Amino acid sequence: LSTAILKQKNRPNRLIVDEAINEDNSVVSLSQPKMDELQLFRGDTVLLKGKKRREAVCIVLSDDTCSDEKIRMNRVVRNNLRVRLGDVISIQPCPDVKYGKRIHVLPIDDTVEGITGNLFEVYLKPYFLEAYRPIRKGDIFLVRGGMRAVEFKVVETDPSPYCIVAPDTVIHCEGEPIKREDEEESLNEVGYDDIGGCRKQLAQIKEMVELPLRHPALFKAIGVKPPRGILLYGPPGTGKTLIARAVANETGAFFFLINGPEIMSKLAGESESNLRKAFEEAEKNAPAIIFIDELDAIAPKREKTHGEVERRIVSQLLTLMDGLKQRAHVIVMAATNRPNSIDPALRRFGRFDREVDIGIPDATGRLEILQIHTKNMKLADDVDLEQVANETHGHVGADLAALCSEAALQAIRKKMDLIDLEDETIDAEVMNSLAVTMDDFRWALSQSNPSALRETVVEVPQVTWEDIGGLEDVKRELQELVQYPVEHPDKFLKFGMTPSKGVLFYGPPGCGKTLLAKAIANECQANFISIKGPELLTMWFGESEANVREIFDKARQAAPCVLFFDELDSIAKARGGNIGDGGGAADRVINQILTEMDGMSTKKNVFIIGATNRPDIIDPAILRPGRLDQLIYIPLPDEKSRVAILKANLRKSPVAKDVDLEFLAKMTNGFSGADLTEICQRACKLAIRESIESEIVPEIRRDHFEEAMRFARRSVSDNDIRKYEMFAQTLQQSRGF
């Protein structure tokens, strides 16, 4: 429902494309049963429509040699118009265009090779006799008096719109033909298909941008105001600017583009005028989209800035933003990677209010990007992109761009024998055969460019219950605390209770407190934000406490979300202990957390979870009803669960059939799940000491586990086990003395 703009199917006038024989591109197909639906008439022009604007306007009709539900058409219309198969041509005629002084007439490429003379006469002139030219600017097709093809372009403008011309007219061949490059920048020009990884954010942009522009009567009918303020933001390199020029190409609205730096590089008293000129050009031209790219360049905080020409431009922009009446039909967009450095006044109601967040893409989204990049490359058969896309984490769209680049250049090194640098233009017997293998993507993925931007990430964890041995009651217990209130709202208001929003895990180390949290976030299919305690205490050597307020906020957009504060013992030991230097646990971040924890509605779909293995030093305030009032003690695994731990840890290993698991599980008593996973890691570490020596077979054996069990060491003491059972019994008391 949030994607509902992607919906496009079932338009009667909407149909696919297929073969033509006719290499004079004047023609356009028909269909006999389709005209039955249509108004179509003999002669002049159709408006056929397609991807990314530009279209073809020329003579039409007679066909049906090829069958129908598909459209005949001249395969040059594929280099023009769309990319290729499967999409739609959209046709209605636009008849009887005006008769002018004739139009255009200039070549591009192959006319310069060979004998020219007066050109258009030499080759093309016989082609128009009483046919005369329904035409549009931008058509490039093959025509000759000769070897049977050369392409051709357009120059002159008598009117701006397209014509059906007459003779007696004056035209000119007097120009110079041209090179390719002007064509590629038409074909490389970006559409909605070059962006990948953001579906959810495009659905919000067309609802905000496109829909009010084309259909202003809608909001006018239900009586609602369109926002004029869209503000895009995200980390560097995430494709913000890219979504700009996509929407530039995809609109029927005049598009003006302001570069923040380009405004500031100007002289004083002048750059004040460039803005005033940009808001005047749009308002004149009916609907329009102004886009101010890199906004925080021109508008930082009036409280920290120096020059008076810097403070005007910010007060200049405010005075234009309020000069927008709905009558004008103008939408102002903007893009910034530092949304918190923007002047606060710009983000208030009536200026920039709607926000759209372009985030770091996840493993699905970054696969979609890798495919948009490499679709021009030639790849080997050993290339598994679903394998690559899994191995790149901190990478945003611009890193995958520089990843595909460092792999191609690694392939050019294996070829450095057959390339010379002393030669002028090298042979093409390598130029064709040079392809990119997976052995390269392993090399690029290990290099510098893997250095990438990495900060708070919000995603569904990949760990399911199947990764967790034992603990079957808490799995049951958690599902109630999280699923049912989010899944079944009817049950709770009925019986009159309000759900509780928070949970505290406690127990000995290594018993799975982290796994339980990531697991339930995957079952509810909610988002997961994880902040380890040592990260709370680090940032304040630079002294920024807004980063805690920023995390609760960030989880609010991501609702439904579980917000998991891990290793709370590290914060309560930030003083060293209860006796310690003599502080309590509450200081620093904890007072800022208990505050922000209370600003969240009990109806909220965000759900907080703590964890600590030091229940003695957690301060009384965290445990209050309304904060984390659900306490759950996770014990060491018993003997029957140690069976279940060992099994799940080995699901990725080539264990032998003869290894007897429940033999281990009952000889290991004070071990936690961290200890058993450590046994398995050494067992495989003794299997490799064979494997390399066995060279100078490969399935881990029953002897190795025997060997590992010797050194194995119990991580939880005999006194610890007891003491946890003291807090396991009553930690409610705690607070109050």
Closest separation in Å from C-beta 441 to its own copies: 13
Which span sits near Mg ion by CB under 5 A: 233-241, 367-375, 376-384, 435-443?
233-241
Which span sits near Mg ion by CB under 5 A: 63-71, 114-122, 271-279, 508-516?
508-516
Closest separation in Å from C-beta 200 to its own copies: 13
Q: Is 511 annotated as a binding residue?
A: yes
The answer to whether the CB of 367 falls within 8 A of the CB of 196 is no
Q: Kindly list the distances between the CA atom of residue 707 and the CA atoms of 126, 665, 666, 683, 711, in Å, as whole numbers in the listed order.
A: 92, 15, 17, 8, 8
For position 457 contacting its own copies by CB under 8 A, the verdict is no
* Residue 136-175 contact track with ligand AGS, rule CB under 6 A, x = bound: ----------------------------------------
Closest separation in Å from C-beta 19 to Mg ion: 43
Which span sits near Mg ion by CB under 5 A: 131-139, 181-189, 237-245, 267-275?
237-245
The answer to whether the CB of 83 falls within 8 A of the CB of 51 is yes
Return all residues near 417 (Cβ < 8 A) that are at least 6 apart: none
- List the one residue out of 410, 375, 409, 371 whose CA is nearest residue 389: 371
For position 514 contacting Mg ion by CB under 5 A, the verdict is yes
178: left (phi over 0), alpha (psi -120 to 50) or beta: beta
* Residue 561-600 contact track with ligand AGS, rule CB under 6 A, x = bound: ----------------------------------------
The answer to whether the CB of 34 falls within 8 A of the CB of 68 is yes
> Which of 204, 241, 259, 591: binder of Mg ion (CB under 5 A)?
241
- List the one residue out of 657, 549, 542, 644 whose CA is nearest residue 595: 549
Q: Is 512 annotated as a binding residue?
A: yes
Instruction: Restricting to residues 207-236, name those near ligand AGS by CB under 6 A.
Output: 236
Q: Is 236 annotated as a binding residue?
A: yes
Q: Is 666 annotated as a binding residue?
A: no
Q: Is 239 annotated as a binding residue?
A: yes
Instruction: Restricting to residues 42-81, name those near its own copies by CB under 8 A.
Output: 49
Q: For tokens 């770091």, what's the residue?
A: 360
Instruction: Restricting to residues 470-499, name those near ligand AGS by CB under 6 A.
Output: 470-471
Both tokens assigned to 538: 């680090």
Backbone φ and ψ for 725, nearest 5 degrees, come out as -65, -15
Which span sits near its own copies by CB under 8 A: 52-60, 110-118, 529-537, 638-646?
529-537
Instruction: Restricting to residues 318-337, name those near ligand AGS by CB under 6 A.
Output: 337
> Which of 625, 658, 696, 711: binder of its own copies (CB under 8 A)?
625
Residue 593, classed as helix, strand or coil, is helix
Strand 231-233 versus strand 606-612 pairing type: unpaired
Sign of torsion over alpha carbons 72, 77, 78, 82: negative
Closest separation in Å from C-beta 42 to its own copies: 25
Partner whose binding site includes residue 402, from ligand AGS, Mg ion, its own copies, none (CB under 5 to 8 Å by kind): its own copies
> Which of 342, 356, 515, 574: binder of ligand AGS (CB under 6 A)?
515
Q: Is 654 annotated as a binding residue?
A: no
> Which of 149, 218, 380, 418: binder of its own copies (CB under 8 A)?
218
Strand 527-532 versus strand 502-506 pairing type: unpaired
Closest separation in Å from C-beta 126 to its own copies: 37
For position 592 contacting Mg ion by CB under 5 A, the verdict is no
| R_g of the chain, CA atoms, integer Å | 34
Instruction: Restricting to residues 432-451, name those near its own copies by CB under 8 A.
Output: 434, 436, 446, 448, 451
> Which of 372, 621, 661, 686: binder of ligand AGS (CB under 6 A)?
372
- List the one residue out of 34, 38, 37 whose CA is nearest residue 66: 34
Backbone φ and ψ for 532, nearest 5 degrees, come out as -75, 140
Read off the DSSP letter of residue 378: -
Rounded to an integer, what distance in angstroms lies between the CA atom of residue 70 and that of residue 16?
Answer: 5
Q: Is 262 exposed, middle or buried (0-12, 13-18, 19+ CB in 10 A)?
A: middle
Q: Is 305 annotated as a binding residue?
A: no
What residue type is 633 in one-letter code? Answer: Y
Which span sits near Mg ion by CB under 5 A: 383-391, 396-404, 507-515, 666-674?
507-515
> Which of 510, 533, 610, 615: binder of ligand AGS (CB under 6 A)?
510
Compare residues 536 and 643 and give the one whose CB is closer to its own copies. 536
Residue count of the chain: 737
Which span sits near Mg ion by CB under 5 A: 94-102, 109-117, 475-483, 509-517?
509-517
Instruction: Restricting to residues 135-194, name those near its own copies by CB under 8 A.
Output: 181
- Indicate the angle between helix axes 513-523 and 472-487, nearest 10 degrees: 40
Rounded to an integer, what distance in angstroms lies between the CA atom of residue 712 and that of residue 299?
Answer: 61
Q: Kindly list the distances between the CA atom of residue 409 and the CA atoms of 37, 155, 416, 737, in Å, as whole numbers in the listed order.
A: 54, 40, 11, 67
Rounded to an integer, what distance in angstroms lies between the CA atom of residue 158 and that of residue 101?
Answer: 7
Q: Is 515 annotated as a binding residue?
A: yes
Q: Is 475 annotated as a binding residue?
A: no
Q: Is 145 annotated as a binding residue?
A: no
* Residue 491-510 contact track with its own copies, rule CB under 8 A, x = bound: xx-xxxx--x-------xxx
Residue 616, classed as helix, strand or coil, is coil
Which span sits near ligand AGS by CB under 6 A: 270-278, 299-307, 597-605, 670-678?
670-678
Q: For tokens 């490499």, what's the residue?
A: 374
Residue 50's CB: how many other CB atoms inside 10 A?
19
Binding site, annotated residues for ATP: 236-242, 337, 373, 510-515
- Chain residues binding Mg ion by CB under 5 A are 241, 514
Binding site, annotated residues: 236-242, 337, 373, 510-515
